[model samples]
Target: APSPEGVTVVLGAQWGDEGKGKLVDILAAEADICARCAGGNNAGHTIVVRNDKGEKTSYAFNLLPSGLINPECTAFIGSGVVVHVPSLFNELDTLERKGLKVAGRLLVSDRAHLVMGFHQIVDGLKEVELGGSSIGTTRKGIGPAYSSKASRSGLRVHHLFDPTFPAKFRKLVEGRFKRYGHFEFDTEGEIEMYLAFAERLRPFIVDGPTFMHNALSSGKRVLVEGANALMLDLDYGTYPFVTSSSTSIGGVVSGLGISPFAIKRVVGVIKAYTTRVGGGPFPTEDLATVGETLQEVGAEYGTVTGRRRRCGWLDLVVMKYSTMINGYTSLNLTKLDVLDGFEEIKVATGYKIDGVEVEGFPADLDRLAKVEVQYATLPGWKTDISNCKTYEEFPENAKAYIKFIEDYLGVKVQYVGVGPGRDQNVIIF
Candidate 1:
């Protein structure tokens, strides 16, 4: 019998912005196909690569796969994602203008839902209506678009070419108008705009299942880039505050229409410390000088919103739960160099709710909010470790920190991210 095909996955293990893009870029260099399975323009990945002149150029990916940095890699946007047509084109145009070749290499799923201008408008209005308890969303219409998808009123990429497209599109808009009591919108003008979009997008659309099956059957190496994180997943992450998507390992199967057996490697990307963007329960959140230092030193800012992230100590309580859901075969510990200045580092080992140790992450927001965190403080390597290229060269304290995480999660630390640069990732055996 022929050898079975294996698909590699890279995901954010803690909230979002765990430096998943840089790792994807490195892995995509040898991958035949690099794909994104969920979220929309709400997720951001900033990848720095040396240009033709050997000078560094930065590329920010929102809806597109960051793996496109690898010139040889074929990029696929899977069916689970919600796409904004104009923004997709805008991103393409921007990348092309930066000298990136995307003409024949990019592929988008026909089954993927489209995010319309109306959804974005509704998103903003919904937040305003929530008053003091707003879920700090990107307000990019991701939640609204997902809501449309769940309601079966969503317009897919293929819908743009349907004969009943106009009527269906109008009905969708009309329903929203009825709910929100009419807002400023251009229904006819939007339809006119989509007419051009259908033609322009036709060449890039494909039947997701067929394309994915063929890619795997042909024994092509595929890399799946997960958007958001387990903590941001709709079902698993904090409720109401989470993004409207499945961001865990199960999402890989649902988002891409792939069999669970096809996934051979699940590499979870974890930042050295913890950082959360937007609002929600962060059990290990540090609001003092430690957080300020991590934020300043790590440059912990939202890639999509530019909002300063809520920084905190690494939480094993969260990581343990994440591993249970994602079943990560290996982990990529990123931004380790950011801890170089500290004399001590703390990792949250567990959580106690009113003096009783909780089994895992609490589901009740009230219970979750009051849980006290247990931390294991470790010695920090005061010396700069970014200059170290190998595991042996890493400081003893750094090695201990890495080992502690590996032992705690029962997963190998395969890749260590020392810095934000492309070449800063250290391989560990």
Candidate 2:
């Protein structure tokens, strides 16, 4: 596989929340620079670390990338991200209060699009209008910001420091306000709020692309962190229901303004089962009472959106597609403990679409909706495997599940996350 010189990419194999943050935190120990390449505030990465008392402390992050958790590492918000200045500052404040040093280590891309308060208003209004048909957006202004960027009318991070920043901000909002006249709140008020936020966020902003390139050239180990999973990618994922950015391996270079020759390895993270948020065609989803039971046990809820994620058995088709698109060299299987008490575990090994068996992912959404999953069932272990450290200590059935996934994906499962804590991961290598 062809790889860049000094970059490593970390991606989620299934839907989001495959536990990439914990893995990135672990890997950040060896990396000097970590950059969030794509997605916006819509994604969240939760990291669990044990404090001195041995009690687990879980940190919820959205705007700031996972790399910020390590003060020794240089953290960057790449150009592809739609920056929400207020949310970024709030996150910085919260982390600072928690004693995480972020002063000189953080950098923001000048070309990164900005998400203003008006974007939030438009998002909320659209969701209300759609009602049941809504895509379950977080209404945090991510989608609208991306829309503006695509339309070439969005504000960038550098605009925050412009002498005519207020004029440019008003120009963008005026047209949107007129187009969406049904909105109740004052658009000027929203713009003023974001202006205040921009004032607060100016200190941490920098030329992200230049900084990243310089770091890479100076022999720094860089990690490009992706937020949303591949299945939620805009162009490649379930359409009209997915996020606004390209959430794949190719996005790492395009989103960060770097060459493909910079990335060295791609780490893809997956779960024992599958879970997806928002409305979309999920072929293997089990929405029955049994599925609800799994959702409850696994806590299938979005950390950022607060929406209940649709839960189902593992789907090898989607996993294989993710592996192929990302060119994953290593895999991290997370949340194996969530399946501890199940009596049986099912994995979708193949799909039957339109009376024909297909080997890989279906490109058409209509065809994808017609696909029937061919599941491979394995015996489940009722015992808790969270405390188990070694592969030998795992229940026989659990070990079989891991082995099955490895054989199915044809990739090495180097890390297994038994629990949510940082120390709960088992290094299989």
Candidate 3:
């Protein structure tokens, strides 16, 4: 059996919005420290938990880790994040005002790069400049911030304390403004407003590496929560259409200052079918009427951007590749309720690129974009399995679908989300 100690990584197996928040919240009971490892405000995890009224309430686009929901847990924003000060403050105020009891529980990584107002302006300008070849970015400056970080010219959380920080920030913005002179740039007044907004977030900053290491050394069970999925990883994902971070298991170590040995289990969370938010190579995509129907039924809207998701069948080839990269030990299948009406479903078993049978996923973006899918069909269940408490109680077709997925992925589905509520999760041994 895998070691049950150290850090446990919970990430999406496909694209973003794979219901990671629910699993993170479920595992938070055992986690002493929960950290958001990668990505920025572009990532969104929707968690549906039962409120005091016994009705399910949904929480989406959590800027902080989901473990904050558990008052006993300490949630830290890891170094891999690109901090959008305004968005962070907005989420923090919402959580605090709603009586979430996050007083000392929240910690921001001092090493995390800060997203400035100019970054957002540059991002929008770049997207518009790309013309018809735009990557469909969230335009929240996530890409631009990561770009500056990569170029070693980005500002970190700790830089806010410097009395000369405003001058430095102004100089950086002025340089960008000069380089992209034709673009519509903000005046000094607007820049000052953004700086003032960021100033309010200074109180939460801490040395994340030191804090996380000390917590783990003191026998704390850490939960490494990732933002995007493996397929959107900058180094390994569909390039040009991907996010600007390493959204894999390797990122957990570098992003949070945790040793590889510190990671115990890698839990892959994915939806019953497949759904991608922005533009990308969706090999198994059902771009027809069925896809639209699934998107409508599942309410597959981006929690962060509110953009409608592109729906499709499960892409096992991509899943297998993601599993190999993350070394996933167990699986959490979410949104099983979304498959209620279909009589038949498909799962991409493999791909045929230029008539060549490929075992694993292709690395070339163009090849992947043009590849044809080979699918394995399965009987779909008409009955609503949302109320089903056990796997055995599921309809035969549903059970078959789960069994086939298990057989295909070669990993046990440890948890199944039957419905939106937290109580709807079914545990299978």
Candidate 4:
């Protein structure tokens, strides 16, 4: 049996949607606490887990946190999350109607902020303010909510019950006129909506920093299920093209309010290839037939936005940078069977800037846009590895493909996903 650690962090190594939810769901079975930190339903992780009825059910969390699927585990909404009260109760009602009991299984931090309706409106207006240069947000008010938190004008999860909530609510409505000038304000209407949610939320709120501290000191196994991938991190990712919160290793510290020493394992979940949503520089993006094939085979579509994802070959150059940023211990390579029919396989092993070889990921947009990728070409396999029950059952070329990724990225391939079903993964050491 694998040694159980006190805390394990399941992070996304690529541009969001590297299948971290599946990995988290897999790891959460042994974890006592699965805590979600950072990003408020913006990343839109699509997790498919078998329900008590023994049927595969697809679920996506916009605010309830992806960790809630495992009913037996303690589901935590850390201080970094922006709680959308309506969305939370809506999802809870969904699970309840499905006969999935979730009562008393939640631990929400009082420090978390609320995602108000106005935030969503302001977010949409901001995107239009950018005009032709939009960052392609999910319009869920994630960025605005975080902005409200930093601006000190945001309402905390528990602050809705304060004696002066109505005044604060009216102020929030009136304040929007500065940016969204003359915008029709629904002052009292929004307050009533929040008031109902505040009463419903009382049972779930707690001091998360203190609770997490005690959990760690007591030798409890805590699993950090981060929202977005490393490449979408605000400071580290492809700049203005990324999400709001710190989605990298540093996020683990700030989002959870936990010590750096608390983390024992970091598993970076990466796709067999690469797929990015919205607009940004994708060095390995294939606009040709291969890209189409990968998109079709992998069903590359955004879970939240429903937009077609930009597909490409696996970029080891990007992977190396991600591994370095997160200090990944092992890799969970997903969607391996997507390359089954291809005649040749290519991996972006290195990149050059302005015809000169560059070492790591470039920071400049001009350099990143003009990057010429160097691919390491490899042979493709015909055998369908999807049904392979054991790692040894894989074709020689299929095994070589994964082996090359391990050797190139300097990380072991611990889990390999050959199909979409949860059981399709082979747990190899």
Which candidate tops lDDT? Answer: 1
Off-target runs (Cα >4 Å) in candidate 3 are: 1-3, 46-61, 182-202, 303-306
User: Candidate 4 on 62-111: residue-level lDDT in tens?
Assistant: 56656667777788888888888898888778776866666688889999
The residue ranges of model 1 lying beyond 4 angstroms of the native Cα positions read: 1-5, 303-306
**Cα TM-score of candidate 2:** 0.93
List pairs with backbone clashes in candidate 4. none
Candidate 1 worst ten-residue window by lDDT: 1-10
Query: Ten residues in a row with the worst lDDT in model 2?
Result: 1-10
* Candidate 3 residue-wise lDDT, 1-429, digit = tens: 222558998988988778787788788888888888888875555666677897765555466887777778888899888888878778777766766666577788889988888888888888888887788788888898998998888888887776767787878787788766645556576557656865676667788889888887887888888888888888877777788888989889989987788888899997888888667578878878989988888888654564678889988898889888888999999998888788888888989978988878888777888888998988889999889888789888988888888899899898898876677888786
Give the number of colliding residue pairs in candidate 3: 0
The lDDT of each candidate is 0.88, 0.81, 0.81, 0.84
> What TM-score, over all chains together, does every model reach?
0.96, 0.93, 0.93, 0.95
lDDT of 1 by residue, 7-100 (tens): 8888889888788887787788878888988888865777887768989888877788888888898999999999999998888888999988
The all-Cα superposition gives candidate 1 an RMSD in Å to the true structure of 2.1
Per-residue lDDT for 204-272 in model 2, tens only? 687877877788788788877788889888877777777788999878998888888887889899988
Model 4 misplaced stretches (Cα beyond 4 Å): 1-3, 43-60, 303-306
| Candidates arranged by lDDT, highest first | 1, 4, 3, 2
